[PDB]
Amino acid sequence: MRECISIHVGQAGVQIGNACWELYCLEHGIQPDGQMPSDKTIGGGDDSFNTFFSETGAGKHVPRAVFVDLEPTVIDEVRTGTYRQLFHPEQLITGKEDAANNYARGHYTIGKEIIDLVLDRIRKLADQCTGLQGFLVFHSFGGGTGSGFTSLLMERLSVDYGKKSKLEFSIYPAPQVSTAVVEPYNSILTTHTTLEHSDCAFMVDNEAIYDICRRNLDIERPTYTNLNRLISQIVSSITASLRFDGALNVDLTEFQTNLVPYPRIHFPLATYAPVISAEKAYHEQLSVAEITNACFEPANQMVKCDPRHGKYMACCLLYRGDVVPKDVNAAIATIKTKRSIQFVDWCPTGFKVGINYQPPTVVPGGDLAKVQRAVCMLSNTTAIAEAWARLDHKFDLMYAKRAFVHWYVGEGMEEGEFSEAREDMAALEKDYEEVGVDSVE
Amino acid sequence: NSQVTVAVRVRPFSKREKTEKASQVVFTNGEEITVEHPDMKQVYSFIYDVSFWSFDECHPGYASQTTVYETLAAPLLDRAFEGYNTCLFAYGQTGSGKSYTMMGLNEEPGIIPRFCEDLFAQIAKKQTSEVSYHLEMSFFEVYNEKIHDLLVCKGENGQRKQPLRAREHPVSGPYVEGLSMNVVSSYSDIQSWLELGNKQRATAATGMNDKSSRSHSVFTLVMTQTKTEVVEGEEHDHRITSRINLVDLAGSERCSTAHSSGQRLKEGVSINKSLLTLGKVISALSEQANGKRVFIPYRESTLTWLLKESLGGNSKTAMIATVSPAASNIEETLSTLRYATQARLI
Amino acid sequence: MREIVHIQAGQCGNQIGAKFWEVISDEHGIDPTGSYHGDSDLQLERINVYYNEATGNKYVPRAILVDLEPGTMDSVRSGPFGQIFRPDNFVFGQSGAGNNWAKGHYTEGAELVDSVLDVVRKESESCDCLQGFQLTHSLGGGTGSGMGTLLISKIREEYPDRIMNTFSVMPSPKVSDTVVEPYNATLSVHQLVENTDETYCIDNEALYDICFRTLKLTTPTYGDLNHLVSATMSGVTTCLRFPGQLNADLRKLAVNMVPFPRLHFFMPGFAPLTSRGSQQYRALTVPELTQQMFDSKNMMAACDPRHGRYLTVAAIFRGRMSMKEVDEQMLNVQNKNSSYFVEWIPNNVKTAVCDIPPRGLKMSATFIGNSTAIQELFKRISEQFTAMFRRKAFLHWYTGEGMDEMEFTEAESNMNDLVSEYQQYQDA
Ligand SMILES: CC(=O)O[C@H]1C(=O)[C@@]2(C)[C@H]([C@H](OC(=O)c3ccccc3)[C@]3(O)C[C@H](OC(=O)[C@H](O)[C@@H](NC(=O)c4ccccc4)c4ccccc4)C(C)=C1C3(C)C)[C@]1(OC(C)=O)CO[C@@H]1C[C@@H]2O
Ligand SMILES: Nc1nc2c(ncn2[C@@H]2O[C@H](COP(=O)(O)OP(=O)(O)OP(=O)(O)O)[C@@H](O)[C@H]2O)c(=O)[nH]1
Ligand SMILES: Nc1nc2c(ncn2[C@@H]2O[C@H](COP(=O)(O)OP(=O)(O)O)[C@@H](O)[C@H]2O)c(=O)[nH]1
Numbered sequence A: 001m002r003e004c005i006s007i008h009v010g011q012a013g014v015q016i017g018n019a020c021w022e023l024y025c026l027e028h029g030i031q032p033d034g035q036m037p038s039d040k041t042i043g044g045g046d047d048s049f050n051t052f053f054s055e056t057g058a059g060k061h062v063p064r065a066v067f068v069d070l071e072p073t074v075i076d077e078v079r080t081g082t083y084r085q086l087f088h089p090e091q092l093i094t095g096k097e098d099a100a101n102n103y104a105r106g107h108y109t110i111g112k113e114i115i116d117l118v119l120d121r122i123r124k125l126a127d128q129c130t131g132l133q134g135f136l137v138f139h140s141f142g143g144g145t146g147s148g149f150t151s152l153l154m155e156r157l158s159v160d161y162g163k164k165s166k167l168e169f170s171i172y173p174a175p176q177v178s179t180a181v182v183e184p185y186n187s188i189l190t191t192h193t194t195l196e197h198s199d200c201a202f203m204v205d206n207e208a209i210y211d212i213c214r215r216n217l218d219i220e221r222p223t224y225t226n227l228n229r230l231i232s233q234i235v236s237s238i239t240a241s242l243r244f245d246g247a248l249n250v251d252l253t254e255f256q257t258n259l260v261p262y263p264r265i266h267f268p269l270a271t272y273a274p275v276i277s278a279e280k281a282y283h284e285q286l287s288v289a290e291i292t293n294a295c296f297e298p299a300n301q302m303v304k305c306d307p308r309h310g311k312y313m314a315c316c317l318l319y320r321g322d323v324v325p326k327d328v329n330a331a332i333a334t335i336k337t338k339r340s341i342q343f344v345d346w347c348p349t350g351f352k353v354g355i356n357y358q359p360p361t362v363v364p365g366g367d368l369a370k371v372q373r374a375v376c377m378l379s380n381t382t383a384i385a386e387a388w389a390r391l392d393h394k395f396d397l398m399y400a401k402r403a404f405v406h407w408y409v410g411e412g413m414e415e416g417e418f419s420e421a422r423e424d425m426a427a428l429e430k431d432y433e434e435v436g437v438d439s440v441e
Numbered sequence B: 001n002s003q004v005t006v007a008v009r010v011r012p013f014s015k016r017e018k019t020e021k022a023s024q025v026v027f028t029n030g031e032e033i034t035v036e037h038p039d040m041k042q043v044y045s046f047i048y049d050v051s052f053w054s055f056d057e058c059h060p061g062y063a064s065q066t067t068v069y070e071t072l073a074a075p076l077l078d079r080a081f082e083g084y085n086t087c088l089f090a091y092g093q094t095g096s097g098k099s100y101t102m103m104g105l106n107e108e109p110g111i112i113p114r115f116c117e118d119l120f121a122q123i124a125k126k127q128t129s130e131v132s133y134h135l136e137m138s139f140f141e142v143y144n145e146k147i148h149d150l151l152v153c154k155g156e157n158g159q160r161k162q163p164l165r166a167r168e169h170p171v172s173g174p175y176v177e178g179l180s181m182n183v184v185s186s187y188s189d190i191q192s193w194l195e196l197g198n199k200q201r202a203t204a205a206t207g208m209n210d211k212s213s214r215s216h217s218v219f220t221l222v223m224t225q226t227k228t229e230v231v232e233g234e235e236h237d238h239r240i241t242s243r244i245n246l247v248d249l250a251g252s253e254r255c256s257t258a259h260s261s262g263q264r265l266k267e268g269v270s271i272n273k274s275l276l277t278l279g280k281v282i283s284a285l286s287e288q289a290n291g292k293r294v295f296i297p298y299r300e301s302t303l304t305w306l307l308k309e310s311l312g313g314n315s316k317t318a319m320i321a322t323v324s325p326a327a328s329n330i331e332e333t334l335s336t337l338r339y340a341t342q343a344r345l346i
Numbered sequence C: 001m002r003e004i005v006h007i008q009a010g011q012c013g014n015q016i017g018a019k020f021w022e023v024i025s026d027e028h029g030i031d032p033t034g035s036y037h038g039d040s041d042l043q044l045e046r047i048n049v050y051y052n053e054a055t056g057n058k059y060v061p062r063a064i065l066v067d068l069e070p071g072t073m074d075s076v077r078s079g080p081f082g083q084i085f086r087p088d089n090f091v092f093g094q095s096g097a098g099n100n101w102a103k104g105h106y107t108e109g110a111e112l113v114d115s116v117l118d119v120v121r122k123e124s125e126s127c128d129c130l131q132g133f134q135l136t137h138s139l140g141g142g143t144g145s146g147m148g149t150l151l152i153s154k155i156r157e158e159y160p161d162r163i164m165n166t167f168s169v170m171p172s173p174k175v176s177d178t179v180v181e182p183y184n185a186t187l188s189v190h191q192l193v194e195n196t197d198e199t200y201c202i203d204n205e206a207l208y209d210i211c212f213r214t215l216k217l218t219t220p221t222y223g224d225l226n227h228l229v230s231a232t233m234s235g236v237t238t239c240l241r242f243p244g245q246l247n248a249d250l251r252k253l254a255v256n257m258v259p260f261p262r263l264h265f266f267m268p269g270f271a272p273l274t275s276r277g278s279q280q281y282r283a284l285t286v287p288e289l290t291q292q293m294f295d296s297k298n299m300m301a302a303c304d305p306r307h308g309r310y311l312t313v314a315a316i317f318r319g320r321m322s323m324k325e326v327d328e329q330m331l332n333v334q335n336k337n338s339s340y341f342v343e344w345i346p347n348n349v350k351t352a353v354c355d356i357p358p359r360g361l362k363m364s365a366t367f368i369g370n371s372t373a374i375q376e377l378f379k380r381i382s383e384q385f386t387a388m389f390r391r392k393a394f395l396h397w398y399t400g401e402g403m404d405e406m407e408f409t410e411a412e413s414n415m416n417d418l419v420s421e422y423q424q425y426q427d428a
């Protein structure tokens, strides 16, 4: 009825897709073998909902997802793991070799000879649909596949499919932390090619979640499991309106109209405010008046970017659980009363609201708690200009000496592409300054 | 104290491009040049040391062929006679004004004949019995960081393209082992040697156009003047060697847009690597003149390595960049400009 | 899958290999008969990175001996792990070199490198996808410096897009085991910097210091030194064999650790090295390992980075550990010790984490570092080189077998220009 395809691209993509499907299988009742013990006892209903999953005759439900890494090490864990009998083999191990942290291999050399199968499986999964709306692409700036393959794939999809909400759930580089010396070179060149074809690009950062998980969940020694089990909740809060019922169901075509004023500022953020554990699950009411402020309170955002250094061009709050709308209106009013939370003159309304009745589930073997009401705030700020500015500064410090460029020209690249991808980010850093200046009456 | 003096030259519309009513993206004012897209949103500026506005034959400051010669090459002549060395670079995408700018046409030539004929005239004027003059030429190329010579008539085999090698004599510097060095005193010899050479050059057909250069080509001259007459007798102790090096380079070939694998990409990768190393040499050597301690990477490329003694110390380099003002060549054009910009930089 | 060919050149290389295979097997469970008697399945999954499969579930490695004196053959054959190697790969010659580089590059090597490449190609084409190569050889001798460099220069001309490492056991400052080390080493670097992608300088005095101070071994032999070099060789090819939360490979490390094509000489290191009694008084964690991997006394390069500036550093962990600690501790090193790092690369640290640790440890680590300090290794060689070339001490053994002084001055000037390349990124 209302389908959505999920394109996991890279190690981060699969490490998040596993956490997402571990949740989507527990919510609806599906098992790792694609089976359903509960609802069949009754003999009716559509619990294993057809938005993300397909169906067969023997009860097997199959997800609508494509996986690709250009490296076997990750997908073979799925093939040999617990969720091996769920996925159709549309998991693309083409990993005779990896992208070596360079955007040039994922884009031209190692990208070609691999992309056509991805397009073919996307096409085979779209023909099954009856009015799909979406393409959720999971990827990672800084890497090669996530930087390059994402760009090439979006460039092909925007031609072959067109007016479909090509959404992105991306990991932004931490300003201090990183795991690659040539990460900015990849990030800038990813943005330059995706700034046209994408429609909305959500953004996280692994440093912010670390700070959160030590401040709120009280984890001093985490892993990536504890981060992706929290990202899966954001994505479920996004997709709940399609899978489940609810008062104000909010779909994916509504995000890009409310949060994206101009096609070049489609870089919003995310945050999950109730990140408390069972020790702290008690002693707190967890009402909407606390959560809507937590979502705006710094030290709870998922990208280290202080919005007090900027403004708010829009905001979307997607509730889920025993939430009454009047509490949401009171909360939004309280937020509008505060002086620190700055709003542009060209958006007095600001907010979109979404409400669902299904609470978040509790992935066992996890760190979160069972809450009766949870929230996700998407947000577009003028603050993220600081981060693009930082990355451009790094790019300049490195490219002034033409460091690491030989690895890129060695795989089909040209210095003009570097300067071209630079200037189209200066233009964006100037746009963010242009729009944030109030209108001259 | 070295000086570089990069430049640009904008070609006029060819008649074919005229009859299409193709648009004009490149504009000027004073000396600065700018590229205004058909979108007219993003505007750029690329101020240079020298600029040759050849967009028409009406505009003030129309830099004709005589002008381009007399403004760049003639200082190189006056320095080659002073006992210095000189190098010239000819960068330009296909269809930009390169061969017209180096060589020219029979009715309005380029730089090379105006170099060689000024040379021979000043020589036969200065050719006394006391001091003599000896010109020794060579003409070689580069291909996937391999050396090849363009002064041999290959017998038709698979190839006799001897993959020659570069060596480093300590005093005289780098050189090529096994290089033909023909002698010339009348310009019509150089034309015959070059017409036997460029046929042996490397090139192949691809999308944008067929006759696209895919190898750098150096044309070297050695002027030795035997002036030294010692008092006690007919002895000639000191003899001044002057090396001139005019190189026609290739294009960058952004291969993300042009599908190419196998050998063509192996050529484009190497051209791009050499262009980058050349940009690095020039951006370090312009700062050399400003007393800043910087090391020049001559060794990462054969082209910049063999010319360590022709792009350093006591010499006068030069770079001329030919770009089109058409609108179907805006991606290409800008690249060239930015290249030249990173060479001048101050 | 990615695959490796391990060439071994000279006594040092062929004695290191007998230890490297002795360990990789232990990690993969193979016995000296070629047979698998492990317990887990991770051992056999990515075993083709180093091995090939024989008839009856036996496993035969991609080793290529290339020596010219058979004194080292029978030591490997008649050993605890020599009955697995392929005898067609035991290349040997007679009439050895004599610690000469010209009798390994020109005279005797030019007669045998064809026979060697005929085996290298065989062990390549059996790979569904070749990633690169490995060359264990010791500068300072004849066959490891000459024949190895010849094979590098020819393999790269035949297989250029792939990787070609080299675990060069470079000379030592104080007590060298050959008088004409500098000649044989300079003429090797002249052909390694132009035909390599990542090279791993190893020095034996540093391994002595490690074996004496950290491990508290009063009687350290070469089997103990090679036991450390093997560990380092293993660390780079761990995320290629075993899984991880953040994977890596030769080429990722090459992109991150090689800013420019010439500066690919690395000071390695491996942690947790400890004594056999002091293991009761420790805590195997990430910060202690980072303390060791950055300490001057653990690096196998015989050169203090405290004299220079890390241009680019890496780290390849193994074990069930956190990524947050991995990020925070390395950032703490970037900040606390910022004088020993470069400012035109803000993140000078790469990371790589596997999940399947070594045979008997809950957590291990590995370290690679590109520092300006290693100029001291080469400058020193130059100060030896021109001390002898200026008077032509041992030259007639190099010219008589085919050479010229030009080939010596070329290498001298190249080495010195590389000393100068690392020097500009040290003071300003
Ligand atoms: C429980 C315990 O305390 O035994 C340890 C041990 O004592 C220590 C000291 C081991 C021991 O290693 C040494 O003493 C040593 C001496 C000289 C040179 C090199 C090592 C050990 O022998 C080494 C051995 O390390 C391994 O298990 C790995 O498999 C190692 N290779 C081999 O063991 C091996 C096996 C068969 C044949 C040849 C080698 C390895 C290291 C890196 C990558 C792969 C494998 C282990 C756990 C220990 C002993 C056994 C005491 C240490 O070794 C390593 C490489 O980590 C030395 O310090 C570490 C920390 C360990 O605690
Ligand atoms: N949140 C999260 N991020 C990850 C995870 N794994 C890797 N990353 C991010 O990925 C970046 C490293 O590059 P990758 O995204 O893994 O690149 P890749 O997709 O593996 O493609 P290659 O570059 O060819 O290896 C790091 O900056 C991490 O922030 C993960 O499991 N969870
Ligand atoms: N670590 C280690 N070093 C060695 C070994 N054998 C020799 N060396 C070193 O290698 C150098 C001699 O090189 P050699 O192997 O004789 O070269 P070849 O004669 O050409 O094969 C000396 O400086 C030694 O320190 C060994 O088994 N282990």
Ligand SMILES: Nc1ncnc2c1ncn2[C@@H]1O[C@H](COP(=O)(O)OP(=O)(O)O)[C@@H](O)[C@H]1O
Residues within 6 Å of the ligand: B011, B012, B014, B054, B092, B093, B094, B095, B096, B097, B098, B099, B100, B101, B322
């Ligand atoms: N300054 C100029 N004035 C008039 N026409 C020019 C000028 N420069 C170039 N052209 C025209 O452009 C064309 C250049 O062709 P070509 O020699 O192939 O240039 P390139 O080698 O740069 O591609 C010629 O046909 C010539 O008529």
Ligand SMILES: [Mg+2]
Residues within 6 Å of the ligand: A010, A011, A069, A071, A098, A099, A143, A145, C247
């Ligand atoms: Mg990867």
